[PDB]
Each structure stands twice: as C-alpha cells, then as structure tokens.
Amino acid sequence: ACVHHIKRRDIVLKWELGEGAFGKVFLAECHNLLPEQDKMLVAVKALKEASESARQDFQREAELLTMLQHQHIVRFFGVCTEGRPLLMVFEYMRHGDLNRFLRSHGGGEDVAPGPLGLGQLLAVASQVAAGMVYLAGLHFVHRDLATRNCLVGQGLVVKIGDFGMSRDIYSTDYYRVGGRTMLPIRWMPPESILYRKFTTESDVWSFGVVLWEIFTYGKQPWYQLSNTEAIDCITQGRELERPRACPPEVYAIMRGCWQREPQQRHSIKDVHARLQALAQAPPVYLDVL
Ligand SMILES: COc1ccc(Cl)cc1NC(=O)Nc1ccc2nc(NC(=O)c3ccccc3)sc2c1
Helix, strand or coil: CCCCECCHHHEEEEEEEEECCCEEEEEEEEEEEECCEEEEEEEEEEECCCCCHHHHHHHHHHHHHHHCCCCCECCEEEEECCCCCCEEEEECCCCCEHHHHHHCCCCCCCCCCCCCCHHHHHHHHHHHHHHHHHHHHCCCCCCCCCHHHEEEEHHHEEEECCCCCHHHHCHHHCEEECCCEEECHHHCCHHHHHHCCCCHHHHHHHHHHHHHHHCCCCCCCCCCCCHHHHHHHHHHCCCCCCCCCCCHHHHHHHHHHCCCCHHHCCCHHHHHHHHHHHHCCCHHHHCCC
C-alpha cells in the first residue's frame, strides 16, 4: 500500500450527492490538499460496513486507483482510515455521470443551448477512447464500460470510472443471475455471453456500444427488447442500427468494433486515432459529413 492518506479534520462534509447498497457519496471541502488551493471541493465515498468482507475490498480498490492515474481516468486523491467511516476522496465532477448529461442535452457556462453538435459528440467519444488506450496499455480489462460509468467535469472534460452505485441507480441495464450477480448483457459481445471470456477485445466491442449511446443522446441499447430477446439478437449476430445524428464515416468505426471474431476488431489505438482527427477537423469538413 503506497496509498496516500488524508486526515479526518481536513475533510468537511456539506451534503449527500448519491447512494448505492455498499456506499454513500458526499460533497465536501478538503483543506491543504493542493499547494495553490488551500480550499477545494471533492466527492467523498463512505464505505457501508467495515467487516472482513468490505475492508479487504476497500484497500484492494485503493491500490488499484492509485496505480490507475491519467488525464481521462477519474482523479483519486487517497483514503481516510482514522476512525470510521472509511472514506475514499475523488475530484468533484460537476455534470455527474455521462448518461445523465447526454439525456439533458438531447444552455449554460460549458455548453450551448440545443442538442450537442457533431464536434461536441466527437470530443466526448475521443476522450472516453483515450481512457481505454491507457487501460489497454496496462493490459487491464474493464468489464463494465458504459456512459453511466463515465463522469463529466467543468469545460466538458470526460473521465472513465467503475462505480459501485451503477448496479443500484441503473439496475435496468443489468441481467440478474444466481443470487447477487449482475451482467451488462446489452454492452457485451457474443464470446462474453456464450463463453464468459473477457478481453481487451470485449472492451472495444463495449466501446462500440458507448459510441452508439453518445450518438443517440443516452438511449438504452436494444431498449425495445427483454433481456432474453437482447441475448438472442446478439448471439445470432444482429447489429444496432445507425443513429440519425450518426454520420456513415462514424457508423463505420462502430462496425469496426463489432466484428464477430475477436481478433478481426480494430485496436482501441486506431479508434482513438480516427475519433481525435475527426473531433479536431476543420469545420468546413464536419459540415459535409
Ligand atoms: C474496481 O474499481 C475500479 C476499476 C477501474 C476503474 Cl477505471 C475505476 C474503479 N473504481 C471507481 O471508479 N470507483 C468509484 C466508485 C464510486 C464513485 N462515486 C463517484 N461518484 C462521484 O464522484 C460523483 C460525481 C458527481 C456527482 C455525483 C457523484 S466517483 C466513484 C468512483
């Protein structure tokens, strides 16, 4: 545990932001955290119990978070383990999760009024893709990549996480098996559902489905279908349709992520490359896409 630590007295709770079965999130002020801010806002996760079950999973999640740090991964500042309750401290991300942001832009300080423009939808996709290049670079497999597990900050910075609360707030996006197991079948490729195999390449398939959620402003993939009807479609090889707002050039990058054979899918590095070049493209070019 080369994990950073914060003293209880440096954290001041303001109010609740959200709740899962195994946690609560608060907005707080953290003192003496950054040289040139002596006062800044953060999001704090309180652990429900402090047993054998939940305290080992805590110091494991922390070690993971400290090693994962990059421009498009959520910023983890460290733990407070003096008395209870055990707290993890993160960067505050003012627009909340990317699914909720997409749905309420389908005007302000950070975004124009009306629906998000082609250049904005590309800027979001390109950022999530840069996160998945760093993770695939450390040979780390996510297993739950979707818009509900990304966050949006001031100036539309977009960063990946993996939040405990997503099974609680968004249970409709999971199929329940056995007792306490939940699978995001709408976001999984055929080899994940049939053979239970999870790879770098099942992540790019999931990225494909994220790019689809972005270009439908937060729509549930296969929303017309029961969980069993969605598994039948995916295993029999059927593809999600091109969203209206989706240019054919972009729907071609989605298709590249959905090639039935894992080893025929484009690498995430090529996908980020295609998306960043587009997001940065001169307007004269985006206008006729
Ligand atoms: C196995 O763990 C991982 C593996 C791989 C990755 Cl890349 C990340 C994780 N872990 C997390 O990402 N953890 C997490 C959990 C809850 C939570 N609550 C937040 N919620 C707000 O910060 C929030 C912000 C604005 C409004 C409301 C809530 S951050 C967070 C991260």
